[PDB]
Amino acid sequence: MDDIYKAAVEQLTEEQKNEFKAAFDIFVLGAEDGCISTKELGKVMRMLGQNPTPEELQEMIDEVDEDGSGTVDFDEFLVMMVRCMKDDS
């Protein structure tokens, strides 16, 4: 019954939705798990233009990770991120 975020994900365009994977793939170059383990995440800050410690990267996951796995996978990245997008509207 979490359709309020699931329905929102459909609002994503094909360009957005398809490219959603594109950047995700940078983190999971050889990740069998299919998730970002903060170690790979440090690249995420670099994209912006920052290279803070992996532990510091983990905090970014910790704050952002609603499930509390300490990791961010494609599904969490895809749906969890929509948690921010929904923002009571």
Binding site: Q16, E19, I26
Partner: peptide, 17 residues
């Protein structure tokens, strides 16, 4: 996505094509 979506531009450099 969450914001402006820096990830769309994030690729910056690439190989293979």
């Amino acid at each position: 996505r969450i914001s402006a979506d820096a990830m769309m531009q994030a690729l910056l450099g690439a190989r293979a094509k």
